[PDB]
C-alpha cells in the first residue's frame, strides 16, 4: 500500500496533455492506440467486463455508480431492438474543464474506447453528445472521425473482422441538465431535455425504447488502456473501493490555476501547492476549500489541512467527490456571495419537471439575496437549513440535491460570518 500516493512518471494513463508531438492517428499509434485490439475484441465481452472489474473502475462525473455493475446490466440477451452507446461530454459543475482537455488534444483514444464499449456489451451505434459551447473542439472531433474513417478501420466491418460500428456526434444547445443521465437521452430524441423516471432504467428502455447506456468520457478514455494493459495495474493506485488515476484540477484561486493527473489518493497540501504554483497569498490566506465542483459541500481550513482526497474520505467528510474544481477560496471573497451566485446559476439552469427543486431553488435564491443584504433573522437561517433537509432526494435528478448540499455545508461550517453580517445590518438600520 502506498503512503497516500502521488504521481510516478509513465504511469500516466494518457499522455499528450496539451500541444504535444502531433495530433493524428499516427500520433495515437505512437502513444499506444490501435495496438493489438482485435485479439481483445475477439475473445468475448465477458472477458472485457472481467478486465474492467479487475481494474475496479469507479464511475466518474461525481456519481459513484461503478462501470462494471452498469455494463453488467448491459449484458441483456439481444432481442429485435438494438443496443446503443451514448458518450456524454458536457461540462457542468462550473470550474470543470474535465474532458475539454481530452476532446481538444486526443479524440483517438475516445474512438478506441467507444469501439471497446460497443463491442463489450452488444452495442451497435454510439452517439457522442458534445456541449454546444464547443464548436471548434467539435470540429476537431469531426476531423478525427474523418481520419479514423479514412483509415478504413471503423465505420463498417471494424478491425478487419465483420463487425460494423458507427459513431455520430450530436451538439448541445447549452444546458446543465443535458449532462445528466436521462435528460441526455430525451434531448437526443428531439424533445426538450427533461429526465425520465428512474425505476424504468436506461438499460431496459432508453433512446426511443432500446437498451442503451451512457458513459463518461474519462471512462471511454480509460477503457481501451485497461483492455490493452494488465489486470489491476490500474488498481494499484489508492484504495480498494475507488482505484486508479483521476484528473485533480484547480480551476480557481491558486497561482497558475491548472490541471494535473494524479492517483486516487493524495495529500491535499502537496496537491495544492507542490503542483500548481502556490495559494494566492499563502496557505493561511484562504477561507475555505470546495472539492467536487458545485454539487459538493464546502471544506473549511481546519478540515482541509488534514483530509486526504479519496471518495471514501469525502463520504466520511459528508461531501461528494467530483472533478476538476478542487479549489480553495480566499478570505478576501465572501463565501455567502459565492454560494449565492452559485444558487443563481442553479435557478438559471434547471428544468421544471419537479415542483420541489423549482420552488426550493426559488426560495433559496431569494433568501440568499436577503442574506447577502443581511435583512433576516436567525430563524431564517435555520429555516434555510430545514428546507435544505426537505428538498434532498425528493426529486428526479440530483440538481436539487446539489442545490441542497452547498446550503448544508455553509450552515454546518460558516455560521459566525452570517451572524456578524446580520449584526452589522442591525447596526446599519438602527
Amino acid at each position: 500500500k502506498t503512503s497516500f500516493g502521488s504521481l510516478k512518471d509513465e504511469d500516466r494513463i494518457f499522455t499528450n496533455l496539451y500541444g504535444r508531438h502531433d495530433w493524428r492517428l499516427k500520433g495515437a499509434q505512437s502513444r499506444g492506440d490501435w495496438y493489438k485490439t482485435k485479439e481483445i475484441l475477439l475473445k468475448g465481452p465477458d472477458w472485457i467486463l472481467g478486465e474492467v472489474k479487475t481494474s475496479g473502475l469507479r464511475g466518474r462525473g461525481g456519481a459513484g455508480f461503478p462501470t462494471g455493475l452498469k455494463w453488467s446490466f448491459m449484458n441483456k440477451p439481444s432481442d429485435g431492438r438494438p443496443k446503443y452507446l451514448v458518450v456524454n461530454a458536457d461540462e457542468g459543475e462550473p470550474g470543470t474543464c474535465k474532458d475539454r482537455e481530452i476532446i481538444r488534444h486526443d479524440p483517438h483514444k475516445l474512438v478506441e474506447g467507444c469501439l471497446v464499449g460497443g463491442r463489450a456489451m452488444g452495442a451497435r451505434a454510439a452517439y457522442i453528445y458534445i456541449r454546444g459551447e464547443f464548436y471548434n473542439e467539435a470540429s476537431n472531433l469531426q476531423v478525427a472521425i474523418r481520419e479514423a474513417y479514412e483509415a478504413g478501420l471503423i465505420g463498417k466491418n471494424a478491425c478487419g473482422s465483420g463487425y460494423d460500428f458507427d459513431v455520430f456526434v450530436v451538439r448541445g444547445a447549452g444546458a446543465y441538465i443535458c449532462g445528466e443521465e436521462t435528460a441526455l437521452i430525451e434531448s437526443i430524441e428531439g424533445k426538450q431535455g427533461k429526465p425520465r423516471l428512474k425505476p424504468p432504467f436506461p438499460a431496459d428502455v432508453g433512446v426511443f425504447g432500446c437498451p442503451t447506456t451512457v458513459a463518461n468520457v474519462e471512462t471511454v478514455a480509460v477503457s481501451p488502456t485497461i483492455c490493452r494493459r494488465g489486470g489491476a495495474w490500474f488498481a494499484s493506485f489508492g484504495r480498494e473501493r475507488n482505484s486508479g488515476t483521476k484528473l485533480f484540477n484547480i480551476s480557481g484561486h491558486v497561482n497558475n490555476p491548472c490541471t494535473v493527473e494524479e492517483e486516487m489518493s493524495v495529500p491535499l497540501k502537496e496537491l495544492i501547492e507542490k503542483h500548481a504554483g502556490g495559494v494566492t497569498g499563502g496557505w493561511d490566506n484562504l477561507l475555505a476549500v470546495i472539492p467536487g465542483g458545485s454539487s459538493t459541500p464546502l471544506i473549511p481550513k481546519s478540515v482541509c489541512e488534514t483530509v486526504l482526497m479519496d471518495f471514501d474520505a469525502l463520504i466520511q467528510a459528508q461531501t461528494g467527490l467530483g472533478t476538476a474544481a478542487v479549489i480553495v477560496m480566499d478570505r478576501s471573497t465572501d463565501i455567502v456571495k459565492a454560494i449565492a451566485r452559485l444558487i443563481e446559476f442553479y435557478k438559471h439552469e434547471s428544468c421544471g419537471q419537479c415542483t420541489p427543486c423549482r420552488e426550493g431553488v426559488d426560495w433559496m435564491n431569494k433568501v440568499m439575496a436577503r442574506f447577502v443584504r443581511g435583512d433576516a433573522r436567525p430563524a431564517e437561517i435555520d429555516s434555510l437549513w430545514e428546507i435544505s433537509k426537505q428538498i434532498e432526494g425528493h426529486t428526479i435528478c440530483a440538481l436539487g440535491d446539489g442545490a441542497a448540499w452547498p446550503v448544508q455545508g455553509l450552515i454546518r461550517h460558516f455560521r459566525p460570518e452570517l451572524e456578524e453580517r446580520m449584526q452589522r445590518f442591525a447596526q446599519q438600520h438602527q
Binding site: 426538450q192 419537479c354 420541489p356 423549482r358 426560495w363 425528493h394 428526479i396
Partner: protein, 230 residues
Amino acid sequence: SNLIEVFVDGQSVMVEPGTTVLQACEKVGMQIPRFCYHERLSVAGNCRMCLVEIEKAPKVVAACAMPVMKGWNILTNSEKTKKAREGVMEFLLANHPLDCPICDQGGECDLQDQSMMFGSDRSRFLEGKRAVEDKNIGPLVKTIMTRCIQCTRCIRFASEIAGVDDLGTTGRGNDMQVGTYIEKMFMSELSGNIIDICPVGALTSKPYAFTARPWETRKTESIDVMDAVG
C-alpha cells in the same frame, strides 16, 4: 398464476403484473392523494404528491409509476410519508395567488381539500410570489394562468386525446408558462372538456364564470341529448 403479494399495512392483497402501486392501493380503498395522475390519460410524475415510504428503502418513491415487485409492504401512515406530504403541500402554495374568493373552484378545489386534509397550517415564504399573466385561449374557456400549478395534465390531454398539439411548456426553473406561444385562439373539438381536466382554478368556464359556487346548486341525474350516445 400471475399474482403479486403486497401488504397494505399488513393487509395482504394480490396485484396483477405490470400495474402500479396506486391501482392496488385504490383497490384496498386507500386513495393516495394525487395531482398529475388521472386515469383517462398517461402517467406523468411531475406533481410528486404520491410519495409513499416503501420499506427497506431510504428514498421515498412515487406510487403512480412504480412497478410492483413480488412481496411488498406499503407504509402509508408512517412518519416521513406525512413529512413529505407536508413538504410538498407547503411547496405548492408558495407561488399561488390569493384568489380563493375570485376563483371559480371554491367548492371544487383540489389544493383546498388536500391542504386541509394533508398539509401544514402555519405558512412560511414571507416575500416573493411571482405571477404569470394570463392568455386568451378561447372565448368559450376563461383562462387565468397565474393559478396554473404547471401540473402537465392539459398538455397530455391535448397530445393524447385531442391530437391538436397547441399547448406546451415554455421556459425553465420557476418560469414555466403553459399554453400556446403564438397568440392563437385555441379552438378545437372537446375544448370545453379542458375545464374539467384542470384540477386547480386556472381553466374555468367563460359563460358560466361568475354565477354560482357549487355548494348551493344541487346535482341531479339526467340523460344527454343531441348525440346518439348519451
